[PDB]
Design a protein around this motif. Structure first.
Motif, PDB file in Angstrom:
ATOM      1  N   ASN A  86       2.613 -43.593 -55.269  1.00 32.08           N
ATOM      2  CA  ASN A  86       2.352 -42.349 -55.989  1.00 32.08           C
ATOM      3  C   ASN A  86       0.918 -41.834 -55.797  1.00 32.08           C
ATOM      4  O   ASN A  86       0.685 -40.621 -55.888  1.00 32.08           O
ATOM      5  CB  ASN A  86       2.657 -42.566 -57.469  1.00 32.08           C
ATOM      6  CG  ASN A  86       2.148 -41.452 -58.342  1.00 32.08           C
ATOM      7  OD1 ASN A  86       2.607 -40.317 -58.250  1.00 32.08           O
ATOM      8  ND2 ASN A  86       1.164 -41.762 -59.176  1.00 32.08           N
ATOM      9  N   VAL A  87      -0.051 -42.707 -55.500  1.00 32.19           N
ATOM     10  CA  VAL A  87      -1.428 -42.231 -55.360  1.00 32.19           C
ATOM     11  C   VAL A  87      -1.600 -41.435 -54.066  1.00 32.19           C
ATOM     12  O   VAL A  87      -2.362 -40.461 -54.020  1.00 32.19           O
ATOM     13  CB  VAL A  87      -2.441 -43.396 -55.479  1.00 32.19           C
ATOM     14  CG1 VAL A  87      -2.437 -44.339 -54.282  1.00 32.19           C
ATOM     15  CG2 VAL A  87      -3.848 -42.864 -55.724  1.00 32.19           C
TER      16      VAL A  87
ATOM     17  N   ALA B  52      -6.050 -41.860 -60.221  1.00 30.93           N
ATOM     18  CA  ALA B  52      -5.609 -42.003 -58.818  1.00 30.93           C
ATOM     19  C   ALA B  52      -6.785 -41.762 -57.862  1.00 30.93           C
ATOM     20  O   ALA B  52      -6.998 -42.613 -56.978  1.00 30.93           O
ATOM     21  CB  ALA B  52      -4.485 -41.027 -58.582  1.00 30.93           C
ATOM     22  N   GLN B  53      -7.534 -40.668 -58.052  1.00 35.01           N
ATOM     23  CA  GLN B  53      -8.669 -40.328 -57.150  1.00 35.01           C
ATOM     24  C   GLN B  53      -9.850 -41.283 -57.344  1.00 35.01           C
ATOM     25  O   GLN B  53     -10.363 -41.799 -56.334  1.00 35.01           O
ATOM     26  CB  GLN B  53      -9.127 -38.892 -57.415  1.00 35.01           C
ATOM     27  CG  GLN B  53      -8.127 -37.836 -56.964  1.00 35.01           C
ATOM     28  CD  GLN B  53      -6.829 -37.907 -57.727  1.00 35.01           C
ATOM     29  OE1 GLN B  53      -5.748 -37.749 -57.163  1.00 35.01           O
ATOM     30  NE2 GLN B  53      -6.927 -38.149 -59.026  1.00 35.01           N
ATOM     31  N   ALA B  54     -10.240 -41.517 -58.599  1.00 41.27           N
ATOM     32  CA  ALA B  54     -11.393 -42.396 -58.898  1.00 41.27           C
ATOM     33  C   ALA B  54     -10.915 -43.827 -59.157  1.00 41.27           C
ATOM     34  O   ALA B  54     -11.001 -44.271 -60.316  1.00 41.27           O
ATOM     35  CB  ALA B  54     -12.160 -41.856 -60.077  1.00 41.27           C
TER      36      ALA B  54
ATOM     37  N   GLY C 278       4.288 -43.508 -43.250  1.00 40.97           N
ATOM     38  CA  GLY C 278       3.862 -43.563 -41.837  1.00 40.97           C
ATOM     39  C   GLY C 278       2.610 -44.390 -41.592  1.00 40.97           C
ATOM     40  O   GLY C 278       1.650 -43.808 -41.073  1.00 40.97           O
ATOM     41  N   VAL C 279       2.622 -45.682 -41.940  1.00 43.70           N
ATOM     42  CA  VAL C 279       1.476 -46.585 -41.620  1.00 43.70           C
ATOM     43  C   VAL C 279       1.938 -47.490 -40.477  1.00 43.70           C
ATOM     44  O   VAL C 279       2.697 -48.437 -40.749  1.00 43.70           O
ATOM     45  CB  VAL C 279       1.008 -47.388 -42.849  1.00 43.70           C
ATOM     46  CG1 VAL C 279       0.423 -46.483 -43.923  1.00 43.70           C
ATOM     47  CG2 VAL C 279       2.113 -48.254 -43.426  1.00 43.70           C
TER      48      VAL C 279
ATOM     49  N   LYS D  18      -8.807 -43.431 -53.494  1.00 43.36           N
ATOM     50  CA  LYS D  18      -7.808 -44.400 -52.983  1.00 43.36           C
ATOM     51  C   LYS D  18      -6.801 -43.636 -52.124  1.00 43.36           C
ATOM     52  O   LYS D  18      -6.049 -42.817 -52.683  1.00 43.36           O
ATOM     53  CB  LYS D  18      -7.088 -45.089 -54.143  1.00 43.36           C
ATOM     54  CG  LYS D  18      -6.106 -46.183 -53.749  1.00 43.36           C
ATOM     55  CD  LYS D  18      -5.284 -46.679 -54.916  1.00 43.36           C
ATOM     56  CE  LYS D  18      -4.373 -47.831 -54.554  1.00 43.36           C
ATOM     57  NZ  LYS D  18      -3.592 -47.553 -53.327  1.00 43.36           N
ATOM     58  N   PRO D  19      -6.775 -43.840 -50.791  1.00 43.95           N
ATOM     59  CA  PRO D  19      -5.783 -43.203 -49.930  1.00 43.95           C
ATOM     60  C   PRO D  19      -4.651 -44.179 -49.600  1.00 43.95           C
ATOM     61  O   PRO D  19      -3.886 -43.856 -48.725  1.00 43.95           O
ATOM     62  CB  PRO D  19      -6.620 -42.978 -48.662  1.00 43.95           C
ATOM     63  CG  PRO D  19      -7.502 -44.208 -48.587  1.00 43.95           C
ATOM     64  CD  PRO D  19      -7.756 -44.618 -50.025  1.00 43.95           C
ATOM     65  N   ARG D  20      -4.678 -45.380 -50.183  1.00 38.48           N
ATOM     66  CA  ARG D  20      -3.631 -46.414 -49.952  1.00 38.48           C
ATOM     67  C   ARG D  20      -3.896 -47.134 -48.626  1.00 38.48           C
ATOM     68  O   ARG D  20      -4.642 -46.583 -47.790  1.00 38.48           O
ATOM     69  CB  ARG D  20      -2.207 -45.873 -50.130  1.00 38.48           C
ATOM     70  CG  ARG D  20      -1.284 -46.781 -50.930  1.00 38.48           C
ATOM     71  CD  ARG D  20      -0.544 -47.789 -50.072  1.00 38.48           C
ATOM     72  NE  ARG D  20      -0.043 -48.943 -50.805  1.00 38.48           N
ATOM     73  CZ  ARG D  20      -0.783 -49.982 -51.169  1.00 38.48           C
ATOM     74  NH1 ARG D  20      -2.074 -50.013 -50.884  1.00 38.48           N
ATOM     75  NH2 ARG D  20      -0.234 -50.989 -51.824  1.00 38.48           N
ATOM     76  N   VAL D  21      -3.324 -48.323 -48.447  1.00 40.07           N
ATOM     77  CA  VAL D  21      -3.455 -49.094 -47.174  1.00 40.07           C
ATOM     78  C   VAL D  21      -2.154 -49.899 -47.067  1.00 40.07           C
ATOM     79  O   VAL D  21      -1.705 -50.385 -48.117  1.00 40.07           O
ATOM     80  CB  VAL D  21      -4.700 -50.003 -47.259  1.00 40.07           C
ATOM     81  CG1 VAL D  21      -4.450 -51.401 -46.717  1.00 40.07           C
ATOM     82  CG2 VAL D  21      -5.914 -49.379 -46.595  1.00 40.07           C
TER      83      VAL D  21
END
Lengths: 102, 403, 133, 77
Positions: free
Chosen positions: B200-201, A79-81, A22-23, A3-6
């Motif tokens: 936080n992620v 967070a990663q998975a 910064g999106v 998950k890198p966020r959106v």
């Protein structure tokens, strides 16, 4: 899946977080049911009082999202998975709540 | 992708300007692969005067230099200042486009205002870079909606809890906790908090998560605002602060452990104040904590969070959830008293889990056992939980003496 | 964007019985009390109204022992007994509110006249100990 | 109808101009009081009375380098 966020707003509440990121713009057996019944999980003894000293709804209307929705699906366990991809939610100003002018 | 040509129906229209009544479709295909072949040979030879004469524009004097190159007669009248106009004609079944040319009286071209005289080519010298960066001379390039009152209040309160200084943060949290009219700004705060815990992620910032959890703890202490309609957003944010595995940027030195017990105390308060039998908040929180704890493959951080929340819920929860899996302590001490890899990060998390477990299970052992407790530790797992229980009985005796 | 105006999980009419049965179960008339009682003991659709009945019982006893109003309590204990023998509804989700209410009827002091209704007080403790066991 | 009627109900709507004016007025007054007390507590402060920061705190007057820009210019347009 990573998950890198959106982010889809950068202009509503949480704009500060979006700007920091910064999106740009719109670009992006103990599990038995009884264990969980609150008779077996609540110190209800403390309640016992010792020597103390309809055309419109009669009852209030509960948060349908809390009562019904699976908010548990917004808990980020790893967070990663992250099993699914979370998306930015727009402010939805619920009008059921009083104390809000509109 | 494919060879693009002029359409074959554009040659039937041209052949009727000539007077040819019927032209078969194999002749029209024979016409349009030749005229679109000669267009591409003057499209690419006009581009050789656009590139060698450095222009990047493809003016109409580039095509006229290429028609001169292919010996074909020039096209007269395309150097005047014009553009691309077209005029649609609907008609009774014949659809077309034309020019609609206009006229002008001849004496209004003899008496037009003349443009200004051009200048001759001259040279100019200027420094572009002087042993380094460019100088700043002008020949270079230069380098429902909140009212304004509460919009300003929202901006100042949210930017006071991002971490510039601690005193403004404490006054902002004492504002959030003790103001009467902060409704109409509760959905903005809930969105800010939930999105910030989500952010936080991307950046595992422990400090900003501690600040957001102190923002939630300040929102709960407000007597005037009712968080019942917005608790479905704040529950998974505090849950994310509890049961996620990487709460740190440097896992070994950051005390993610405190954001664990602080958020566990927070969620025990959020399901004490708001759990109703229509809500089923507490049962649904215990079920998530329980199936995260009983299930193997879970990291020691998320098991620490699960045990911390379950043990902050109360005494009967640790009676009927924690105490059946006390044998799991043996599976923990498998990797503590005897680990092939000692220098990994599992040992600090494992003995943190151990310390929390025996600290919370010492009063539970003090509640449901004999007063002697001679070899309860030996009967217990690893003989340590029992020593902690003896210490807890001693502490209870000290508290009774103080009373 | 405004979320849709939600509806209560009871019919507008649904709220009314809650209202007729509760206003009959406070025992102004004895045959009514019974009509309501009859309803509670054998209504099959009395689930999905049971949180509001449990909350009305629990909240009532706690603000009804502030002044020791014996009838208010004897009627609520009969309402508990009528809730229990209904075979359709699932009660042990709500027993964590039901049990401290009955313990309070049995283990509490009486703020009203000490003698005379102590005969009923023994029955208030008789009805409470019956439903407790 | 109760055994079978299933007609939904809604929450009581407050469409009264008096109480809506009162709610909007009191919420605006409370948010501007909270904002001004927060800004007077986290900055330089003045006081009409001797050592008076809890009750009636004044944000201290700061001089501008160009004062006509903050005076004459409109902010909502």
């Amino acid at each position: 899946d990573t998950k890198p966020r959106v982010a889809e707003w950068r202009y509503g509440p949480a704009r500060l977080w979006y700007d920091m990121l910064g999106v740009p713009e719109d670009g992006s057996d103990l599990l038995a049911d009884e264990n969980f019944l609150m008779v077996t999980q609540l110190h209800w003894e403390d309640d016992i009082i010792w020597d103390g000293e309809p055309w419109y709804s009669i009852f209030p209307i509960d948060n349908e999202d809390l009562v019904y929705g699976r908010w548990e699906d917004n808990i980020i366990w790893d967070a990663q998975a992250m099993p699914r991809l979370l998306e930015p939610p727009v402010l939805t100003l619920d009008p059921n709540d009083e104390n809000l002018i509109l | 992708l494919s060879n693009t040509v002029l359409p074959s129906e554009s040659m039937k229209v041209v052949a009727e300007s000539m007077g040819i009544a019927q032209i078969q479709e194999e002749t029209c295909q024979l016409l349009t692969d030749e005229v679109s072949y000669r267009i591409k040979e003057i499209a690419q030879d006009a581009l050789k005067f656009m590139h060698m004469g450095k222009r990047q524009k493809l003016t109409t004097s580039d095509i006229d230099y290429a028609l001169k190159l292919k010996n074909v007669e020039p096209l007269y009248g395309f150097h005047a200042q014009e553009f691309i106009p077209f005029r649609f004609a609907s008609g009774g079944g014949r659809e077309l486009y034309f020019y609609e040319e206009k006229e002008v009286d001849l004496s209004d071209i003899i008496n037009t205002p003349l443009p200004r005289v051009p200048l001759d080519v001259c040279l100019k010298a200027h420094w572009l870079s002087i042993e380094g960066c460019q100088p700043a001379i002008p020949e270079n390039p230069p380098p429902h909606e909140l009212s304004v009152e509460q919009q300003l209040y929202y901006k100042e309160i949210t930017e006071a809890c991002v971490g510039s200084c601690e005193a403004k943060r404490a006054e902002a949290l004492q504002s959030i906790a003790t103001d009467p009219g902060l409704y109409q700004m509760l959905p903005r705060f809930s969105t800010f908090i939930s999105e910030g815990v989500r952010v936080n992620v991307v950046q595992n910032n422990l400090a900003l998560l501690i600040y957001l959890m102190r923002m939630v703890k300040a929102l709960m202490d407000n007597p005037t605002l009712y968080l019942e309609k917005y608790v479905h957003e704040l529950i998974p944010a505090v849950m994310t602060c509890i049961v996620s595995r990487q709460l740190c940027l440097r896992p070994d030195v950051d005390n993610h452990w405190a954001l664990r017990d602080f958020a566990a105390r927070l969620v025990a308060q959020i399901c004490k104040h708001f759990s109703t039998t229509t809500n089923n908040i507490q049962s649904r929180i215990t079920k998530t904590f329980t199936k995260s704890w009983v299930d193997e493959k879970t990291p020691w951080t998320t098991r620490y969070g699960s045990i911390a929340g379950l043990a902050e819920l109360g005494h009967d929860v640790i009676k009927t959830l924690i105490l059946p899996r006390l044998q799991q302590e043996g599976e923990r001490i498998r990797s503590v008293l005897d680990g092939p890899v000692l220098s990994n990060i599992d040992r600090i998390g494992a003995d943190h889990v151990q310390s929390l477990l025996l600290k919370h299970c010492a009063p539970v052992l003090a509640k449901l056992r004999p007063p002697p407790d001679n070899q309860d530790a030996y009967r217990a797992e690893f003989g340590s939980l029992g020593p902690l229980l003896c210490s807890q009985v001693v502490k209870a005796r000290a508290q009774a003496a103080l009373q | 964007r405004l979320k849709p105006r939600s509806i209560h999980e009871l019919s507008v009419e649904q709220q009314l019985y809650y209202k007729e049965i509760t206003e009959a179960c406070v025992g102004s008339c004895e045959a009514k009390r019974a009509e309501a009682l009859q309803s509670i003991a054998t209504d099959p659709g009395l689930y999905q109204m049971l949180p509001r009945f449990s909350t009305f019982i629990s909240e009532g006893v706690r603000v009804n022992v502030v002044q020791n109003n014996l009838a208010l309590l004897i009627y609520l204990m009969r309402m508990v007994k009528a809730l229990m023998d209904n075979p359709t509804l699932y009660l042990e989700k709500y027993v964590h509110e039901l049990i401290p209410a009955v313990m309070t009827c049995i283990v509490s002091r009486q703020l009203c006249l000490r003698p005379d209704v102590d005969n009923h007080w023994a029955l208030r403790d008789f009805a409470a100990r019956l439903v407790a066991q | 109808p109760h055994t079978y009627i299933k007609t939904p109900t809604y929450r009581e709507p407050v469409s009264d101009y008096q109480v809506l004016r009162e709610k909007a007025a009191s919420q605006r007054r409370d948010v501007e009081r909270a904002l001004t007390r927060f800004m007077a507590k986290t900055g330089e402060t003045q006081s009409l009375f001797k050592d008076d920061v809890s009750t009636f705190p004044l944000i201290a007057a700061r001089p501008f380098t160009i004062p006509y820009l903050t005076a004459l210019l409109p902010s909502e347009l």
